[PDB]
Structure formats: C-alpha cells, structure tokens
Symmetry: D3
C-alpha cells in the first residue's frame, strides 16, 4: 500500500493544513503586538465572528497564572505526548530552544498529558532571557514560585511536581497543532489575558486589528 497514497488527491489538503502564511504586515511587528495588547480577548473574539470564525479560543481548561492584562505574541508551536522512552530528545530540545526568538508566544500541545509538566523554572528563565512574550501549556507546570518571580505570563491547565523527563517526549515543534477546537500555526497572533488565550490567523491579523479598534472607538461614542 504505497500506490494508495498516489491514488489519493491530497495536495489541496496538505496546503490547507501544513501551509504557513508568510504575509507581511503594513506596520512593524512590535506595533502590531502593542496595538493588540490594548484590546480585550472577548472584543477580538467577537470581531472574528464576523469572519465566520467561531472556534479560535483555546479551550476553557486553560487558565492564567495571574489576572493578566492583554499580552500578544507570535505563535511558537510545540508538540509532545506521554512517553516511556527517555533517551534522545536533546537533539529536538536544543534545536528547539535556539529557534525561540523575541516576541514569541509558546503554544504547547501536550497530547492531553495529565501526569507530568512541560514548563518549569528553567524554561521560564530561558524564555525571559530570549524576551519571549508568554507561554500557553495545555498541561502541567511546576516551579511556580520561580515562574511568578520571573514576571513571565503563563497559561496552563494544572500544576504538579512530576517532571517531563521519563514521562513525556517532544516529537515536533513549529508545526501546525490543534488544541481543543482551534488549530495553531507558527506566526499566528496569540492573545492572552484574564479570560484565556485566543488565536488570530496571521492572514487576517491586520484586518482583525483595524476592525477591533474601530468597534472599540464606536462603543465609547455610542
């Protein structure tokens, strides 16, 4: 069964699922992020309803470590799963850390891991030093005293003392991932605040920003 794939017509599907938008914005990247941070997630969420997008929020199990005001960044996706295997990983993890840059917003698909943590004090200190914006973990975190002391926004599901080593393995990073109902791609605009994490597709990020600001200004006057 290698002729079965050739019997299929998957070119349109591969482009739809694995295609990444290299679209440039009419404004600077930091200006785009700063202007998004002047909006609530609910307001941006309602705007994307007008674009017929109803499943852009991370699931309700995701909660912020503090009652944050809006923080915006560009998606850096990570994919892991519970795994008994221990060896390896350094090749994936060390290469992954080198690709994390300033203004990245980590979005981590843990394959619904409920036993271990994927983000702790070392990851937080590394992300702070690289000037990342925040991290959204669909799973466990630990070393929360160190995380709080670092003043680094973190969105998570639960907290436990079990480490990742010997319990999970990273399999991919900077690929499209799916958490809850929303698909996240590298470079998407990620917005998080007191009411969770929101995903804005990069192709409409500038248009969604202008529409959200336009709604915000009309509400004050009306």
């Amino acid at each position: 069964y290698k002729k079965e794939i050739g019997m299929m017509n998957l070119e349109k599907l591969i482009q739809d699922r694995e295609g990444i938008s290299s679209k440039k914005f009419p404004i600077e990247d930091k200006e785009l992020l700063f202007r998004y941070e002047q909006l609530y997630t609910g307001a941006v969420n309602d705007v994307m309803r007008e674009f017929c997008l109803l499943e852009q929020a991370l699931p309700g199990r995701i909660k912020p470590l503090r009652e944050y005001h809006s923080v915006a960044g560009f998606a850096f996706t990570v994919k892991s799963a519970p795994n008994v295997k221990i060896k390896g990983e350094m090749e994936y993890r060390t290469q992954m850390l080198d690709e994390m840059q300033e203004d990245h917003f980590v979005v981590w698909d843990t394959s619904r891991d409920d036993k271990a943590t994927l983000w702790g004090g070392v990851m937080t200190a590394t992300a702070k030093g690289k000037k990342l914006k925040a991290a959204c973990i669909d799973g466990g975190i630990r070393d929360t005293h160190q995380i709080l002391n670092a003043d680094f926004p973190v969105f998570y599901e639960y907290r436990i003392s079990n480490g990742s080593l010997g319990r999970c393995l990273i399999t991919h990073y900077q690929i499209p991932i799916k958490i809850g109902d929303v698909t996240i791609k590298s470079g998407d605009i990620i917005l998080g605040d007191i009411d969770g994490v929101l995903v804005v597709p990069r192709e409409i990020a500038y248009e969604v920003l202008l529409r959200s600001e336009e709604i915000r200004e009309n509400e004050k006057k009306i």
Copy 2:
C-alpha cells in the same frame, strides 16, 4: 399519540415540578436576605439536612470569582443550550432583562455548555444598574476585568473569550431548572459565599433561617 397523554395522570407531577410557591414571609424581603448573609453556607446546608434535604448545593464545579462573604438573593432562573441558530433571541433576551429586578440572584443553566460564555461585562453592568445581588453561571464568563471592577458577585465554572452569539441560545427563563443535583425555582432563596452556591426552597426559607440562627447562638455558648 395524543391520547397517550390523556391516558397518563400527570397532574400531580406537573404541580410538583412546575408549581411555584407564592408564600409571603413574616419579615421584609430585605431583612430575610440580610439575616441570611450573616450565616455561612455550610451552616445553612446542615440545617436543611434536618429537613431531609441532602442535595441543595450547586455542584462543586461552581466556584466564586472572589472569596466572598455570604450574599443572598431571590432566584432568577435562566435556561440556555449550545445552538448553531443565531437569529431571534432578542424577543427572549429583551423581555428577560425587563423582568430582572432588585435583589434577584441569577441562576443560569447552560445545558453544560463548555464552548461559550453566558455572562460578561454588559450583563454585569446591567445587573449592577438593576441592583441584583449576584449571578451563578453553570458555564463560562468573560470580560472579567470589567466584572471585578463592578464589584458584582459572580459564581462560575470556567472563563473563555468565546461569546454567546452564534454558539448558544436562551430557550427559557423564570422556569424551574436543574443544575447538578439541585432543582432551582423562581423565588427560592439563593445563598453564595467562598464555598459555592446554596438553594433554600422558598416554602421553608423562614423556618431554615430561624433554625440556622438558633444553632449559631447555641454554638457560641457551648
């Protein structure tokens, strides 16, 4: 099959489930609420055990937005469910808002909706202006910065940025509803604090109050 309903004897069931108590209290409504707010929910819960009522608390998934002291009000019930249909609703929603009065305590059955919110900044500002006591949502809330700034007690399950429009529809209000194990009827005494939300049937609300105060005074002396 319209003779099947006539073949049934449902008069006793309809009165038991849909019957509303129009009982008046020997004291003023605001005095009843104020005296209930001098009691912990656990103390009132134990008293209703003596009335053979073991399922009067909202389920443990309900949590307060702040570590509230006791807040009491009269139940204003709302019923919604996830729904793809968008149009309509204004007839239900505008009529519903007009019936919300001072000292009401909103109890919202969302049909276990886990994707959208039913209570946000607009509902909170509306409830504050009408001098409602609190709101208990078996589901999602958003605009939490606005909710906290309004100093309005809110009990909820989760937080997410998805709005209700296009994801849920209100089907009924001011009818008997069931959340978890407890049935809530309009006019029931609703008590909420740091340990969740409690339902006191209106027919025994005054007797439960006197018994709870009597227990409270005997504990101090013994």
Copy 3:
C-alpha cells in the same frame, strides 16, 4: 444594547451558519441514496478528506444497534435539552412529526442528555410508517425489543428506561445542529453503518459520490 447588534456585521456569519443548500442532484434522490449505500463510511470519509473536510463523522460515542450495512438518508435535524418544564411541547412535537417524510434520516442533538431517552417504540413505529431510513440519537433510547422487531436502523449512545416526558424538551427542529465536531443541516446526506454515522454536505454530495465510486473501482483493478 440593541444598537450593539446593529454595530456588528453578522450577515456573512448568518448565511454561513443558517444557510441551507437547495441544490438539486443530476440523479433521482432514491438513486443517490442507493448508490451511497453501496459504499463504506470509511471510503466516503477518506474522499471528503480531499475536500479538506476532516470533521464530518459523528463522535465515537455513537454506536449502531446492529452491525448494519450502509444506510443513507437526508438529514432531519432535531434539537432538545434536559429540562424540568413539562407543559407545552405538543405544538412542537406534533408539527415536527408531520414534517418527517420518506427517506429522512433523523439526527438528534440532545444537548448531551445522559438521564433520559429521546427515541423509543412509538417514535420507531412512527418512523417506519413514514418510511424513514434511520435515526441517530446523541443520547438514550429505550423499548429496544420493539426497535429491533421493527427492523429500523438506530444509532445511539446509551440505553435507559427513563422517558423524555418530565426530563427533556424539544426546542427546535430542522435547524442546523452541532454534534461533536460536525455540523448537520437539513437535507445533508447522512450515511451510517457498522462504524458510525457520517455527514456529507448537500452541496458536494454528488461530487463525493462520483469520487468515492471512482476510488472503489480503481482499488479492485489495482
């Protein structure tokens, strides 16, 4: 807040979610259904992957009462939710039954009701007399001896003896509904067999049929 809806641009969303396809097929309706019944659900599922549709199957909790071969029909959608209210309903239910016609495939959204049943012996006998194709209930069924004796395909979640009266209420029918990840609209082609229930959007039903038959013939020769 009635100017807020006028401040929104929801025309595109309403058409996308509530729009129904009145597309006619190049073949007779019964020929379309019969040709779909010569295909497995997995084969039709793989074809819609080529259309970039990955969430067209009813959730895995849906199981067939018997190990059926493929049965196809046109979607008749029903929406209900758990409800304490008893009175009314006849207006909704009697009008609903009159609209069920030959070759309809009932798809019932129960709002994840886990306490009562929505389909029993009376509904089955009614559906058999009207020459419906099958029924898919995202919830409970009962009178299974009568259902099996009627030779009527039924897909369901669980079985329990609690009836719908006094525990649930129908709120809508023949509207778009959402069960699991898939949205079902009236007139969609519904295909069910031993491996669950599948939804084919009416707008591509004829093209999906030809592609599925083309794949089936190429597999035999290769």
Copy 4:
C-alpha cells in the same frame, strides 16, 4: 465535638434514609415478581412518573450482558470501594453470602471502581445455586464465559481481568446505597431488561404493578 450531634435533630433524616419498609404484599412474592416480568422497564418507569419519581433508573452506564427480557427480584445491596488493604474481608464476605436467598437481585455499589471486578464465575455459580434472580454491578465483571454458560442475568459497566482481592474491599451490605441518581434499599423491587435496571420502592410496588398492568391493557384496546 460530641455535643454537636446532640445539638442536631437528625431523627427524621435517619428514618428517611435508613428506614426499611417491612410492608407485605396482597399477593405472593413470586407472583409479584412474575407479574412484573410481564412488563417493560420503560412502562414501569413511566408509571412511577405519576408518583412524582423521576430518578428511579440505574445510570445509563449500566448495560446488560444479553438482550434480556424482564427479570425481577428483591434488592440485595452491597457496598465496596477501592482499597489497598487485603486482610480481613472473610468475616464480611462469608456472612454476606449466607444472607443471599432465593429471588434476590444483587445491586452492587463499587464506589465507582474502574480498576477491578466485583463479580465473576464463583459469585455467579454461588448465585445460581441459591436461585438468585440477577446481579447489577456498577463496575467490572470477569469470567464472562462462565457467566454466559450459567444463564444468569448480569448487568454491568465494563469487563476487565483484574480481581477484587488486593484492589477493593466490601465495607457494607444490606444497607441503603446510592448509584447514579437512585437510592436502593433492601427489599425494593428491582426490574432489569434490555434497557437497563429499574428500582421500584417496596412501599408502592403493588400499586405501581396494578397501574402498569392497567396502562398495558388500555393501550392494546386504544
């Protein structure tokens, strides 16, 4: 805190929860059971709705091992929970088996145990020899080849090969138990068939029987 219990008025609660009905029936016990076995569980369920009883069915997770016709018996309640402790138990188990008599219907509350089984080949052979009617286990069973060969009706949740020894312990038997929404007391009439298990309180069992038979005869003529 031993004066706190004396400060409470729990006599009414203890009688309501722990009181057992010693009511005799106007007919023989075996005639009562045989006449109940001529009715479907859904029909008896609807009759108890007229008695304002809406939560008399075992939860939908309970399923029959075979598509049984109606089997009726008198409730023999058992209570266990997952437990690491191994020693003891014989005092509880041997005394428990001696109290199982003819026409008993075992209803087993396992405290939602999902790791081990409470009913296997030895219990089935013991129940067959004592002429019990059936067994309803809110948990796991095993030795299913032996159970099927014994022709003994069994209602259960799941099947697994883990035994009870070293994983669970029986703590009580012949006491009131609660499974799902229904409370079961010793001597209650237990009815099970293809659509699950149903509980009829002993105090109304004869009146429910006459009403169910009356409904059944009126349906045939109308």
Copy 5:
C-alpha cells in the same frame, strides 16, 4: 470458597502492600521535616526519579488553598467513601482523632467523592490544636474562611457546602491508601507546596533528602 485463599500464595503480596516501615532516621524527626521544607517539590520529585520512582505525586486535581512554601509532615492516612448510611461513625471518628499527633500530615482518600466535604472548620481547629502540619483532601472542603483564618495548609480538589454527615462514611484510617497513581502509607514523608503534594517513602526519606540537598548545592555553584 475458603480453600481458594489457602490455595493462593499471598504472603509476599500482603507484606508488600500492608507492610509498614518502622525505620528510624539518623536525625531528629523535626530536623528531617525542617530540612525537607527547604526544598521545592519538583526538586525532590526529580531525585526520586533516580530511584526509579515516577508516580510519587498526588494527582494534578489536587491544588493548594494558598501559594504555600514547602510544608513537610508524616502521613496520617484516612479512607472514606460516599455512603447513605448515617449511624455509627463516632467509634471510628473519635478513635481517629485521638491518634492524630503533632507533625502529622493528613492524606484523605475520599473514594473520589464529588458531592460532600471531608474537611471543614472543626477539623482544621482540631488539627491546629494538635499541631498537625497540613491536610491533603482528595475531595471537597468547606468553612474556608475559618480555614484561612487558622493559617493551616490545606490541599484539596473542590469546595462545596455539603457536609459529610449523611453523604459519606469513614471506613479506615492509618492503612495504606491509593490516590491517583501513588500509594501512601502511614509514616511516609509528605511534602506539599505551590505545585501540589508529594510522597516520599519512609525507607528512602533520609537518602532522598541528602541527594536533594546535594543537587541543590551543586546547582548554585554550576
């Protein structure tokens, strides 16, 4: 079937599951606890990985009432389950309270009770007076205003106003219990902080302490 147990060889299993370590430490008990309280749970968790122990943390559903720094104590295990039976209990409860001593850390297996609470204001005041270290409840708590005012560390799952009386019963205490993936025995070292509760087997508690301190000192220098 009393020869079946004699046919089994369970001596090794009984010693493994019910055996309690009476090992003495080379240092004072309070010095062992104080030195453990200078470590984070994640650091001690990683050390026990070197001992091939990967399931020593309480499940992620356990959360602290406050963002505690490390608190350590010796395990006092309690086992309860939901139960309709009310009478008795005083014999178990009064004897249980007398055995709670200074520096005990209560670990309570509630058999996954989701309806009632096992720890409130009276238990907290009793534990404070006996100089217990903390309490970990795999279930509900109430009287949280009193708990917070007592400055007593509490780890829990949810909060609700339903009391234990009439809804649960204690069946055992000071026996081996299992919560989530971890087995807890009396005398085990229990460590809790902002990231949950951790179990250190008493037999390796001193060796785990020295290794954790050795790792901590090497990290500062490297």
Copy 6:
C-alpha cells in the same frame, strides 16, 4: 542546560524503563503461546498477584470485537498521537510493517486519540498475511465488516469512520509504552479474551504459566 543531565544519575532509570528482556524460554515459542491460550485471563491475572503485580491489565475501556477465547502473542508496541502534520510517515510506517512477524500481538498506544482510527481493513489484511495473533488498539477502528470477515482478533475502544491520515501520526514503534496503568515492552506475552487484554512480563512468563496451570489442575480436584 546540558550539564543538568550530567548532574543527574539516570542510568538505573533508563535500564528499568528502556531495558528489554532477551530471556529464552525452556519451551518453544508456539508451545508457550498455545499453553497460555488454554487459560482464562482472570486466572493468569490472579497468579501475577502472587508476584506483587496488580496493574497488568489493559484498562476497562478496551473491549473485544467478539467474545473471544484466549489468544496469546508477543507484544509489538506502536505509539502514535493526534497530529495536524500529514507529510512523512511512510518512512516510519513501511519500516514498521516489515518488522511485524508471525505470532506478534500489536499493542497500540494512540495517546488517547478520540477522533480517528489507527486500525482498519488494510492493517487487518496485512496482519493476517503475516500470521499475527491479534491487535489491541487503545482507540478507534473502522472497516469492521472487513475485520470480522478476516477472522482476526481485535481489541479496541470505539469505532468511527475517520481515518488516521491527516489526524494522527506514528512517532515510535517497538519501544516501551504505557496504556492505562500497565507498561508494555516488546516481547512481553499478551493474552486477550472476552474480558480484555492482559500483559505478562517476559521475564516471568514461563513461571507464571506453570503456576497458572498448577492452580488450574488443583481447582478441578478440589
């Protein structure tokens, strides 16, 4: 943080988790499997209790497609997870199929995938041609008509028509995996029947067989 791993002592952990037993049996492989197929899973499960092994059964969500008698094979482990990424996989899948040999028993960890299937008609026909014994999928299957016609034992969780392509990706095979509470390694003896799937560690497989046969013979005489 590459010195942190060198600061750890993980050699004992890696050998415990990733070590594979190359132990040879005193009898032929097919004789070992045939003699295991003369035993029920519950009997072998009880024997491993004497070895202090209480978590050797696959979780209760695993069910057989037919009421099988005992089938035994050597574990061939597979690991996958839900994934949006489509490309690749052939390198993993084609190499994986070449390593499947006669008398293998596939045990598939899907990372709790609830949306897609991992085993269908093509995998079944491939496994039949290679003379595999059975397949245990902790997830979805499809093409069940083809599976039943092939007379190939299959243990699974649910059935759905969604294929694996575009919804999951295989990441590892022939590594240690963990499903539920049990860890499965390549070469372990896998036993499945009407009551689920059981894992016998290869190091004790021959001793467990002799003890199980000894118990079986003593039961007939006593």
